């Protein structure tokens, strides 16, 4: 499916990033999303988001320039930032250095998204 997967030599090797594509927006999908799993039981997700280690990177949210400069993100959205951070690991999912770098990048982007969400929540409640 090419989304975060290297299907070569008759195997299916992944770098752990889940490109959750082909479903659709929450409103456009009759089932409110793809419903990847059951855990909150309704774990719903749309087409633009990506998941690493059961952590969802949101595509609808934008990257503040303050959060762009620090943590050094590249994509315009958090989903795009995650998609750009994992480019190096897609072609070499087995390499230990790539796995360590992907883990570090995903933690950085997760912390950036938490900071942005806290800021937006505080501003909205303000």
Partner 1 sequence: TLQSSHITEWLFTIHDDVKKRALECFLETAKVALKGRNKKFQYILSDTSTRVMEIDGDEFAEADYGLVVDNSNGTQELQQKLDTLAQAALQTQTLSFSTITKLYTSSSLAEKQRLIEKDEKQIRERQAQAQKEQLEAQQQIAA
Partner 2 sequence: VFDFKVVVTNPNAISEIEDNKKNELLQRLQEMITDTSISEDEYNIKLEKLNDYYTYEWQDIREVRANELLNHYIKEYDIPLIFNNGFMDAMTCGEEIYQCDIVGGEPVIERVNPLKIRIFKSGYSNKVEDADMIILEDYWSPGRVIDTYYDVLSPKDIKYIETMPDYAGNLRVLRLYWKSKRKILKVKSYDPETGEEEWNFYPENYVVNKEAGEEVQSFWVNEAWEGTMIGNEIFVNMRPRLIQYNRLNNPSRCHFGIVGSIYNLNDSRPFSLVDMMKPYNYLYDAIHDRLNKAIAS
Out of 25, 42, 54, 60, the residue judged to bind partner 2 by CB under 8 A: 54
Segment holding 5, helix H or strand E: strand 5-6
- Torsion sign, CA atoms 121, 44, 38, 42: positive
In sign, the C-alpha dihedral spanning 44, 3, 92, 98 is: negative
Subset of 11-30 contacting partner 1 (CB under 8 A): 11-13
Q: Looking at beta carbons only, is 29 or 99 nearer to partner 1?
A: 99
* Cα–Cα distance, 75 to 22 (Å, whole number): 20
66-105: which residues touch partner 2 (CB under 8 A)? 71-72, 85, 88, 91-98, 100-101, 104-105
- Residue 99 binds to partner 1 (criterion: CB under 8 A): yes
Q: Decide: helix, strand or coil at residue 13.
A: strand
Question: Binding residues for partner 2, per CB under 8 A?
Answer: 1-3, 5-14, 18, 20-24, 29-31, 34-39, 43, 51, 54, 71-72, 85, 88, 91-98, 100-101, 104-105, 108
């Amino acid at each position: 499916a090419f989304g975060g997967w290297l299907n070569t030599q008759g195997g299916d090797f992944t770098n752990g990033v889940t490109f959750i594509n082909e479903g659709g927006s929450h409103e456009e999908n009759p089932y409110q999303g793809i419903q990847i799993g059951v855990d909150g039981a309704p774990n719903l997700v749309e087409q633009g988001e990506v998941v690493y280690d059961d952590y969802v990177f949101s595509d609808r949210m934008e990257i503040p320039d303050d959060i762009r400069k620090e943590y050094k993100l590249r994509g315009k959205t958090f989903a795009k930032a995650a998609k750009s951070a994992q480019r190096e690991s897609e072609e070499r999912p087995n390499d230990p250095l790539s796995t360590k770098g992907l883990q570090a990048a995903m933690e950085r982007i997760a912390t950036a998204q938490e900071e942005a969400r806290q800021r937006k929540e505080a501003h909205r409640e303000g």
